[PDB]
Design a protein around this ligand. Structure first.
Ligand SMILES: CC(C)C[C@@H](C=O)NC(=O)[C@H](CC(C)C)NC(=O)[C@H](CC(C)C)NC(=O)OCc1ccccc1
Ligand SMILES: CC(C)C[C@@H](C=O)NC(=O)[C@H](CC(C)C)NC(=O)[C@H](CC(C)C)NC(=O)OCc1ccccc1
Lengths: 237, 203, 235, 240, 213, 200, 204, 216, 197
């Protein structure tokens, strides 16, 4: 099956495109990121990973717009290219209509741009998984995007290495998240991110990044000093 | 150039004069300003001869492809919309005013006037060209709703006759066409046949 | 047989060309970059092949701007195009905003150019392969002395201290042992030379080593042979 | 072999394998059924919810291509979303050029030709989605068309696309759709989807219902929840 | 034939102080001898420390403000910091020169706090030339407003006068007095005066009524 | 606008008025016509304010990139040619620019005049602007290569002052710079009003 | 007119088995004569010559461009160009610039390569080709030349007579034009030989 | 449109509590001639927005086609988001300015009236892209004649009842009919409220010609 | 306004140019050289609109230099003149037309001395003696009266001085200093500037 796996254009005789699946594996290799939403706020929690003890952790949360924020898993450069497309599209909505772009409408445009490489020859599926947290007239939204170019609306979703452990936590506590206050909602995400962490590792201000968007709050990324209040109230694993 | 179209129940009557003039010289004294875009759709052409003929040929080709592809008789509104789109896009380039009248199974007899500037309006009676200004009062006073096909044919001929007498550009023979489900019947009125209105007699 | 295209994902999920380009960096000479509150220090191994080559011709450490310098490892020729992009970008930022570009902003811009390679790219002339150079950018901005790492993958990460080159893994273990947050620039320069001397096959000498420093008070300065001799004599 | 690598290569038998491989991807996808009635067309999708985490209404397989037209898709969703965008563009272009709502037979032909272009070249792979377009107009009447990855488009009184198309088609055949009105058919489309679904594997399905017809005044719309709930109740009672 | 530019009127003034910056504008928008609206403020808040006043063809003013806002958002995304008043001044010159062949008909004065916290006023000609000034007036009444500002703020042509540092209260009385005087002698200015004060706390807006006509 | 530059044994003296005028209206009395391209190079601005500022700033960027790429400062001649080539492309499009490029290079002290028309010339003494004619007469009468540094400063101050008196567009203060092998220095900025008392 | 700026007069006449072409030798920017040795008649095919009058730049450019095409044609075809074909080639070159024309009116005098039949032709600035059995005249003094030629020309003139007739017409006609003159050069084309003679003309 | 052809006269807008009312005549005139005497110059963009245009009918008809497609496209998405009256106004300002910059302007002045989220929006977009929002709006000769009457009543009493606003618009239309050569008796009134946009059919203002006898 | 003159003798070409550069009513420079050395034995003198003169001449000079480097032999004066005429004529109908009047002087070992006159319109004429600018109208008559084809180099300078002396006596414009150069088998040689003051 070596011939089928080499190019995106080739269809395997089993009806599958191997190159798209290989790109999806790249998102799995990246660090775990968990995003969940309540009635009032939507949050992104990121396990920043350090190449060396000396090295600082890579950025995992980025500001697309005042009402939109993204968590990146997979190849960082592909994410930055996708983020620039999203930043330009949201700005174009503000310039033309003087309104924030509906978060759902942006995800549809991202899906279209990601799909075109998969069909054409000499192109690669973008190897990134993005969690989009945004607040629009409809309310808080959490969306997951894949190299397959399929985008899904999620009450909560976790992407990256050991994401399944975070997903199990989210499924059990899904009912509590909607009515929870912002501090409770962020804490639920921190616990889910901890499940991904190996038992030896512990959540710390340096390795944790939190992004919050809400009815009265523009997307804010909380730094290591800023994450300390959210992490201060916690329970031992 | 005077071009007129009047809608009748189940049909449309289209009329035009026959004069093409460069300055005060008549190049053609028998010009046909009624062009068949499709089997039951015709256009009356006013303005530059070259611009009108080119636009009419392009619409006939486009409407012909459209009808063959859809395997259905074309709509008058579709023909008018194609003319409006070309006229508006090149409004600065083309000095052309066209009245599109035809029969569709769905909406029967329809007259649409696309004036210079590419605007489309459906009107019970439409008049166009240099002679149109002289006959505006006659058309408004004479037109009566419920006019029969013969009454519309008389109405169009009487109006065109008045415009041709008072307009230098309008003249020659009156060409009339009537479009209905049965088909298109075309007649030419000349000399005695052209309606005559008494001139003032005070030497 | 080069059957796979330049943009092909591995069964594991990593682009084949990017991984091969990361292997190319291992061939490159070791460069030690340390960030200290007093200043950021960049050091590199010239690796002169023969006595005949003039030593000054090798230029591993280059000045992106007065406040920003970069040390390079891997294929030097690939780096020149990236270095030119950085210099033009810093000058453009001055013209448009009348301010110095932050080191992170410069590293992000060069990093963006790293993955822009395509076989079916519209431009008749476009990069066909990933860049094969690793760049350490060290500079002082409003945030303070800062050092950043650029990889052929296009990932940019701020580093307190890092080594890029053939002996990077061995040097990194040594750097982690000797790195303290309170270290002064003079201590960092001495530590960088000590790690470089151990990793370098040739004995350390003023000609075979290039060292440069950026401090908030002074613009990027490359140590002169006399200046290099004093630090090496202390060893 | 090597005869199956490109869409620009015919097999010694005369078959382009890459297009066949694309059709297989549609067969893997969950079933979508469209039934045309005297009043208009009704559509149903056996949407499968992979995870409880996904919010309800995510990954919709029913789209509104135009005010009067609706699309039911089975296959790669990303390709189907791209085809929906092409369908929306074609209808918009027709309205601008000819001034009237695009006839469905024409929309199906134009979109099918776009799907066909992919099958002819090595540079671009064929689309992996099959879709049904449904519309009602007083002059046109109810019309249902289905387009395969090959690009063939044929009108159908009733159609099923997906894993259980063969099973659904026998159940669809039993219904006398031409006599029945849309309100009656909405119960039947729910019944066929529930019967076709496999409880043992590919469980946790959700039913998406859409209709265009006299009841909707010729505007394709998602079936109202009150009617949808009644239809699901009929399907559950019938399954017993 | 078609004329691409129309004069929509309006006058703007910005005064810089040791700890404050005040940008003021009339609210009247007028085409020819007719008043389009009595409430169209010409002051727009670029950032927490910066307010830009734009007077001239209104269509050019609206587009330029929209372009500046996008550039500010783009800078924050790329540089991870909000643009300083001086940087906005340098960027605005480049945007204006980009349209040198088809110029924007807008007179722009930027008023904002500098990095040290001292007040800074930047004045721009339509093509793009910019300079930093303690006080500048732009628009239809710029010629009327500027001479009093030289006499009082600059103490020019006055001998044996103490050069007291400008006070927020004194500067605000001067801004009201100059605009009231201009409304009396210039047809374009009038209706109301929008005063925006930039300080470390934030931007504070005050409106004082001016003669309707 | 009066701008004057001359070359003498000690170096190059660059001086300018500070008045910017919109038609009759005097927009500014503090405009800085002389721009510092690099620590060893200066550019003088005359005619259109935006045109001169944009193009001289673009020359400075090109000179900075040249220094980084070639590891040496650009020649006065090379900088002057670069400005001329960039302006020539826009010839006939209405750019109005009069500029003097003054600096010290390995070749020696250098003075060049570049204009929107495209003339580029090197001279011992040049004056550019509306008041250039008035400045030229005073400078020509008192100019010598042998002038002492202090006398040279006075000649530049006097020529600008006399020009401001005759020319309506010239005005404000005279800003004087001296280019030396070490680099340029801003010798002084003197308001014409104060100079008027001293000269008279 | 643009044509009058540099001036110039060229004419061709047909004889029994000979053709003749003559041109003024003055090159002038307007009222000032820069040179008296300017070339307006260019050899094309040994017995085929083209005389160009109009803007001096255009006269030089068209001769240079025509030679490029003719040299390529002769190499590929393997044969000397026929006189009619040269008229077609020059007409194509002039028409290519119809919207912005070269300001030159070409006159062609030649003998057929095999038959040796006399051929004379004239073309307009935009490439219209006119072929005549007697004389073709182009230039600032065209009306004067037409008057002299119509009266002087006679059929079946011998080469010596053709030379005298073309010379008398050119000399008297350039005498009545201020911007043409300063000498005239006459070429007599015969199958056996080419005779080139410079006439004595008033210099003023 | 460097040169306008068939054109429409003034369109008037007034804001009342709970909605906006815009009134336009039904005449398209080629120069002096009243060529088309039954044309609607008011368009219902969506449930919350209506647009009235003065200027080339062809350019207005083109805008109606483009605006209508954009609204149809949004409805297809069904994301629960619909364009606000302000959003349509922002789009028009960008579209008019872009054409002005290209030097191929759309020769139209448009009044956009909408009611959304318990607020009433009235906006003006010019051919050159000049745009503003005001309580009372008028275009063409309406600015010179009708706007002074509308502004005086509004300045004295800021909030107007729907009935009072229709009464004011009818008085203004009569004033325009008397003093504008391009005015026509038949006109359409469009009102936007929480319920939606309603356009009334041809309406004629009664006229008093008593002054004609007084001329003697 | 600017002045160029060329006198050609049996074994040499004598060329002179005005040394004044002027903007408006003021002569900014009195040392300007309008002579550009295309090759060891070729000089191109250019007078015309500002900017166009330097841009065209420098481009021709650099292209002529490239020919020597690429082929190892310099162009003939006739070839260089034909190369300038083609480039100027090609640019004449182009959006950017150069307003340049050029005089080309060179000595070729095989064909001897050459002087070429080219107008802005791009007409190339080989002339025994030629001049450019308003000064030519006064100067050319003197040259026609006193020029003999066998004139010696010393006599050529005497003729040149007479032409320049007339310009001082009758020309409205002030052209005090003229640069003089000669081209012969040895090569281009600078001659002392003729300054009337
Ligand atoms: C069916 C009609 C559109 C044909 C007919 C009736 O209007 N056309 C016309 O009456 C119009 C008159 C209008 C231009 C004022 N005439 C025309 O369109 C042209 C006149 C030319 C000067 C362009 N008719 C014509 O015969 O053109 C001959 C011509 C064409 C080019 C140059 C010189 C002469
Ligand atoms: C003040 C220096 C920077 C330049 C100096 C040099 O001569 N003078 C100038 O630049 C001239 C004065 C000159 C015309 C006599 N001044 C100007 O050019 C002024 C700049 C300030 C005075 C407002 N610009 C101006 O008034 O018009 C600029 C413009 C250009 C195009 C469209 C609209 C407006």
């Amino acid at each position: 099956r070596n011939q089928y796996d080499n190019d995106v254009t080739v269809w395997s005789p089993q009806g599958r495109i191997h190159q798209i699946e290989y790109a999806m594996e790249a998102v799995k290799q990246g660090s775990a990121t968990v995003g969940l939403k309540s009635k009032t706020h939507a949050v992104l929690v990121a396990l920043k990973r350090a190449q060396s003890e000396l090295a600082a952790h890579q950025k995992k949360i980025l500001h697309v717009d005042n009402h939109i924020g993204i968590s990146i898993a997979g190849l960082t450069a592909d994410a930055r290219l996708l983020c620039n497309f999203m930043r330009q599209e949201c700005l174009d909505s503000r310039f033309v209509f003087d309104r924030p772009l509906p978060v759902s409408r942006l995800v549809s445009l991202i899906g279209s741009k990601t799909q075109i490489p998969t069909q054409r020859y000499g192109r690669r599926p973008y190897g990134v998984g993005l969690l989009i947290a945004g607040y629009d007239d409809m309310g808080p939204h959490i969306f997951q995007t894949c190299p397959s170019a399929n985008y899904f609306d999620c009450r909560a979703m976790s992407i990256g290495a050991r994401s399944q452990s975070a997903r199990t936590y989210l499924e059990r506590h899904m009912s509590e998240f909607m009515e929870c206050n912002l501090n409770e909602l962020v804490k639920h995400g921190l616990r889910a991110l901890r499940e991904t962490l190996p038992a030896e590792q512990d959540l710390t201000t340096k390795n944790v990044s939190i992004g919050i968007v809400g009815k009265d709050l523009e997307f804010t990324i909380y730094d290591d000093d800023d994450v300390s209040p959210f992490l201060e109230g916690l329970e031992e694993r | 150039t005077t071009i007129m179209a009047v809608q009748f129940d189940g049909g449309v009557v289209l009329g035009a004069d026959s004069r093409t003039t460069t300055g005060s010289y008549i190049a053609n004294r028998v010009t046909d300003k009624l062009t068949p875009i499709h089997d039951r759709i015709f256009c009356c052409r006013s303005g530059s001869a070259a611009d009108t003929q080119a636009v009419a040929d392009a619409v006939t080709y486009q409407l012909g492809f459209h009808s063959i592809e859809l395997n259905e008789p074309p709509l008058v509104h579709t023909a008018a919309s194609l003319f409006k789109e070309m006229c508006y896009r090149y409004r600065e380039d083309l000095m052309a005013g066209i009245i599109i009248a035809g029969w569709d199974p769905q909406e029967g007899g329809q007259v649409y006037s696309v004036p210079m500037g590419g605007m489309m309006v459906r009107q019970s009676f439409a008049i166009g060209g240099s002679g149109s200004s002289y006959i505006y009062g006659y058309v408004d006073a004479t037109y009566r709703e419920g006019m029969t096909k013969e009454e519309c044919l008389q109405f169009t001929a009487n109006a065109l006759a008045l415009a041709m007498e008072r307009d230098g550009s309008s003249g020659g023979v009156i060409r009339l066409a009537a479009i209905a489900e049965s088909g298109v019947e075309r007649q030419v009125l000349l000399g005695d046949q052209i309606p005559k209105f008494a001139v003032a007699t005070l030497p | 047989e080069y059957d796979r295209g330049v943009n092909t994902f591995s069964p594991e999920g990593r682009l084949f060309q990017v991984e091969y380009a990361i292997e190319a960096i291992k061939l490159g000479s070791t460069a030690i970059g340390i960030q200290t509150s007093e200043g950021v220090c960049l050091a590199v191994e010239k690796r002169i092949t023969s006595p005949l080559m003039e030593p000054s011709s090798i230029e591993k450490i280059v000045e992106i701007d007065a406040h920003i310098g970069c040390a390079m490892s891997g294929l030097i020729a690939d780096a020149k195009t990236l270095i030119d992009k950085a210099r033009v970008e810093t000058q453009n930022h001055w013209f448009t905003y009348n301010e110095t570009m932050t080191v992170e902003s410069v590293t992000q811009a060069v990093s963006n150019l790293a993955l822009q390679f395509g076989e079916e790219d519209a431009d008749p002339g476009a990069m066909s392969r990933p860049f094969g150079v690793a760049l350490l950018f060290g500079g002082v901005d409003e945030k303070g002395p800062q050092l950043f790492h650029m990889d052929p993958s296009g990932t940019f990460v701020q580093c307190d201290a890092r080594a890029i080159g053939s002996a990077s893994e061995g040097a990194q273990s040594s750097l982690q042992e000797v790195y303290h947050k309170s270290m002064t620039l003079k201590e960092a320069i001495k530590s960088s030379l000590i790690i470089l001397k151990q990793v370098m096959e040739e004995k350390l000498n003023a000609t075979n080593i290039e060292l440069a420093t950026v401090q908030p008070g002074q613009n990027f300065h490359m140590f002169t042979k006399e200046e290099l001799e004093e630090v090496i004599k202390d060893i | 072999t090597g005869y199956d690598l490109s869409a620009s290569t015919f097999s010694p038998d005369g078959r382009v394998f890459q297009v066949e491989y694309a059709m297989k991807a549609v067969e893997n996808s969950s079933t979508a059924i469209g039934i045309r009635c005297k009043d208009g067309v009704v559509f149903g999708v056996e949407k499968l919810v992979l995870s409880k985490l996904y919010e309800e209404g995510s990954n919709k397989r029913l789209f509104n291509v135009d005010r009067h037209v609706g699309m039911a898709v089975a296959g790669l969703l990303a390709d189907a979303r791209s085809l929906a965008d092409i369908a929306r563009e074609e209808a918009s272009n027709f309205r601008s050029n000819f001034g009237y709502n695009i006839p469905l037979k024409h929309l199906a032909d134009r979109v099918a030709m776009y799907v066909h272009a992919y099958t002819l070249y090595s540079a671009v792979r064929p689309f992996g989605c099959s879709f049904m377009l449904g519309s009602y107009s007083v002059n046109d009447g109810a019309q249902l068309y289905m387009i395969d990855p090959s690009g063939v488009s044929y009108g159908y009184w009733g159609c099923a696309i997906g894993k259980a198309r063969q099973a659904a088609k026998t159940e669809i055949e039993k219904l006398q759709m031409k006599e029945m009105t849309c309100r009656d058919i909405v119960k039947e489309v729910a019944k066929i989807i529930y019967i076709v679904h496999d409880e043992v594997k590919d469980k946790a399905f959700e039913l998406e219902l859409s209709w265009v017809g006299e009841l909707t005044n010729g505007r394709h719309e998602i079936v109202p929840k009150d009617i949808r709930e009644e239809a699901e109740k009929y399907a559950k009672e019938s399954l017993k | 034939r078609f004329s691409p530019y129309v004069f929509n009127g309006g006058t703007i003034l910005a005064i810089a102080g040791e700890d404050f910056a005040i940008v003021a504008s009339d609210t009247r928008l007028s085409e020819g001898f007719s008043i389009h609206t009595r409430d169209s403020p010409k002051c727009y808040k670029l950032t927490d420390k910066t307010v830009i006043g734009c007077s001239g063809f209104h269509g050019d003013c609206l587009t330029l403000t929209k372009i500046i806002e996008a550039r500010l958002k783009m800078y924050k995304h790329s540089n991870n910091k909000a643009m300083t008043t001086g940087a906005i001044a340098a960027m605005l010159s480049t945007i204006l020169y980009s349209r040198r062949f088809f110029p924007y008909y807008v007179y722009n004065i930027i008023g904002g706090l500098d990095e040290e916290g001292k007040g800074a006023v930047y004045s721009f000609d339509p093509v793009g030339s910019y300079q930093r000034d303690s006080f500048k007036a732009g628009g239809s009444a710029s010629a009327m407003l500027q001479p009093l500002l030289d006499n009082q703020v600059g103490f020019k042509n006055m001998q044996n006068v103490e050069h007291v540092p400008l006070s927020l209260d004194r500067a605000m009385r001067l801004v009201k007095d100059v605009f009231i005087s201009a409304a009396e002698r210039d047809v374009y200015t009038g209706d109301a005066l929008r005063i925006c004060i930039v300080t470390k706390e934030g931007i504070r807006e005050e409106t004082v009524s001016l003669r309707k006509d | 606008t009066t701008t004057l530059a001359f070359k003498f044994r000690h170096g190059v003296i660059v001086a300018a008025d500070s008045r910017a005028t919109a038609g009759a209206y005097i927009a500014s009395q503090t405009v800085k016509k002389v721009i510092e391209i690099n620590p060893y190079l200066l550019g003088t601005m005359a005619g259109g304010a935006a045109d001169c500022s944009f193009w001289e700033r673009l020359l400075a960027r090109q000179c900075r990139i040249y220094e980084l790429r070639n590891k040496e400062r650009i020649s006065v001649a090379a900088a002057s040619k670069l400005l001329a080539n960039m302006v020539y492309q826009y010839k006939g499009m209405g750019l109005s620019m009069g500029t003097m490029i003054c600096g010290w290079d390995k070749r020696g002290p250098g003075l060049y005049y570049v204009d929107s028309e495209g003339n580029r010339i090197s001279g011992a003494t040049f004056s550019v602007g509306s008041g250039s004619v008035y400045a030229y007469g005073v400078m020509d009468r008192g100019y010598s290569y042998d002038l002492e540094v202090e006398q040279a400063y006075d000649l530049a101050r006097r020529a600008i002052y006399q020009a401001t008196y005759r020319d309506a567009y010239s005005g404000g203060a005279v800003n004087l710079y001296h280019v030396r092998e070490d680099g340029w220095i801003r010798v002084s900025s003197d308001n014409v009003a104060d100079l008027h008392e001293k000269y008279s | 007119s643009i044509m009058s700026y540099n001036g110039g007069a060229v004419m061709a006449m047909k004889g029994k088995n000979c053709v003749a072409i003559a041109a003024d030798r003055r090159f002038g920017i307007q009222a000032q004569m820069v040179t008296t040795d300017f070339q307006k008649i260019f050899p094309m095919g040994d017995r085929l010559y083209i005389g160009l009058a109009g803007l001096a730049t255009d006269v030089q450019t068209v001769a240079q461009r025509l030679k490029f095409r003719l040299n390529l044609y002769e190499l590929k075809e393997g044969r000397q160009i026929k006189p009619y074909t040269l008229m077609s080639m020059v007409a194509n070159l002039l028409y290519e610039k119809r919207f912005g024309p070269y300001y030159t009116e070409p006159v062609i005098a030649g003998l057929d390569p095999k038959t040796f039949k006399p051929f004379i032709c004239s073309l307009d600035l935009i490439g219209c080709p006119m072929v005549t059995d007697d004389f073709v005249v182009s230039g600032t003094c065209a009306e004067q030349m037409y008057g002299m030629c119509e009266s002087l020309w006679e059929p079946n003139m011998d080469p010596d007579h053709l030379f005298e007739t073309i010379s008398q017409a050119m000399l008297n006609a350039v005498d009545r034009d201020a911007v043409s003159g300063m000498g005239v050069i006459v070429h007599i084309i015969e199958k056996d030989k080419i005779t080139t003679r410079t006439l004595k003309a008033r210099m003023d | 449109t460097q040169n306008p052809m068939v054109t429409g006269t003034s369109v008037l807008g007034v804001k009342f509590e709970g909605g906006v009312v815009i009134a336009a005549d039904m005449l398209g005139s080629y120069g002096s001639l009243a060529r088309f005497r039954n044309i609607s110059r008011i368009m219902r963009v969506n449930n919350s927005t209506m647009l009235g245009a003065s200027g080339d009918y062809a350019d207005f008809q083109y805008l109606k086609q483009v605006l209508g497609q954009m609204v149809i496209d949004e409805e297809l998405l069904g994301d629960g988001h619909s364009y606000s009256p302000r959003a349509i106004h922002s789009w028009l300002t960008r579209a008019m300015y872009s054409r002005r910059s290209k030097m191929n302007p759309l020769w139209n002045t448009m009044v956009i009236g909408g009611y959304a989220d318990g607020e009433s929006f009235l906006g003006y977009v010019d051919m050159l892209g000049v745009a503003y929002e005001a309580p009372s709006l008028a275009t063409g000769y309406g600015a010179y004649l009708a706007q002074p009457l509308l502004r005086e009543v509004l300045e004295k009493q800021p909030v107007l009842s729907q009935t009072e606003a229709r009464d004011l618009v009818e008085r203004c239309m009569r004033v325009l009919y008397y003093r504008d050569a391009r005015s026509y008796n038949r006109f359409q009134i469009a009102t936007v409220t929480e319920k939606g946009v309603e356009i009334e059919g041809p309406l004629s203002t009664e006229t008093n010609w008593d002054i004609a006898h007084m001329i003697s | 306004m600017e002045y160029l003159i060329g006198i050609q003798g049996p074994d040499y070409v004598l060329v002179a140019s005005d040394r004044v550069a002027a903007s408006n009513i003021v002569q900014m420079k009195d040392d300007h050289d309008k002579m550009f050395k295309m090759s060891e034995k070729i000089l191109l003198l250019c007078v015309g609109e500002a900017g166009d003169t330097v841009q065209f001449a420098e481009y021709i000079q650099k292209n002529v230099q490239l020919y020597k480097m690429r082929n190892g032999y310099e162009l003939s004066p006739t070839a260089a003149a034909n190369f300038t005429r083609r480039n100027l004529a090609d640019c004449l109908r182009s959006r950017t037309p150069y307003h340049v009047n050029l005089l080309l002087a060179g000595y070729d070992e095989h064909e001897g001395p050459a002087l070429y006159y080219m107008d802005y319109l791009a007409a190339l004429a080989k002339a025994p003696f030629a001049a450019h600018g308003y000064g030519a109208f006064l100067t050319l008559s003197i040259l026609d009266r006193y020029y003999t084809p066998t004139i010696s180099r010393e006599r050529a300078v005497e003729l040149l001085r007479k032409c320049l002396e007339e310009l001082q006596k009758r020309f409205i414009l002030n052209l005090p200093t003229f640069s003089v150069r000669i081209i012969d088998k040895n090569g281009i040689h600078d001659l002392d500037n003729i300054s009337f003051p």
